[PDB]
Every structure is written in structure tokens, then in C-alpha cells.
Nucleic acid binder design. Structure first.
Length: 48
RNA sequence: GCCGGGCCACCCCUCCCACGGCGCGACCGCUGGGGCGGACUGUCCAGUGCGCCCCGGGCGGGUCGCGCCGUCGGGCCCGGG
């Protein structure tokens, strides 16, 4: 059979609904305000 | 000294181009709010970007058009009396 029909036929391309499965990289302001929130929370607990 | 032409000087009108200034309009990026979908953060319920739409405003520069101002401006110092 291989010697008879050796050609390869590609699988047809399929439509995509464009769903991301990973996590996008966090942004500069996002991480800066995360650090700010952490500092505020720690100081709040220290006062409390 | 012998007869004509043209030009700039009078006085007035009008074209184009160049330069500088002022004001208006069209296209741009950057920046404060609202609506939507979601993703994330914080040892108080609070907050942060993201993609779309609405954007009411600001910013100046790059180009274009418009109007005015100024030039012992340039067009044989355009042309008309």
C-alpha cells in the first residue's frame, strides 16, 4: 500500500474561536499597584 | 538744441508668486469621564491594566484650504486709467 499511494494529503485547516488558555503578562502599573497594596495592607496590620 | 517709444516717479484699481505674523476649518498621535466583555491584585469589601463603543475637552507640531496684515519684495518694477 505504501508503494502504491505514498502521497500525503494535509488535514484541512479548521476555524478558531480564539480562546486563550494561558495567562497574559502583567503590566507595569498593575504590578506597581500590587506592591503598593501589599505595603498598605502590611502597614494596616502593623497598626492594627 | 531739432521728432517719436518704453519704463520708473503723481494719483488711483487689480493678478500671480515668495517671505513673516494673526485668526478660522479638515486629517493625525498623546492625555480625564461613562457604558460593555473579561483578566488580575490586596492578611478592610477596595483597586489595576486590557479590547470595543461613547466620547464632552486639552496639547502642539506636519500638510492642505480660507481671510487680513507687512515688503523703498519678485514677475524687463504683471496688467488698467
Amino acid at each position: 500500500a505504501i508503494r502504491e499511494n505514498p502521497v500525503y494529503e494535509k488535514k484541512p485547516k479548521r476555524e478558531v474561536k480564539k480562546k486563550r488558555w494561558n495567562r497574559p503578562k502583567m503590566s507595569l502599573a498593575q504590578k506597581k499597584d500590587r506592591v503598593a497594596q501589599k505595603k498598605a495592607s502590611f502597614l494596616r496590620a502593623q497598626e492594627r
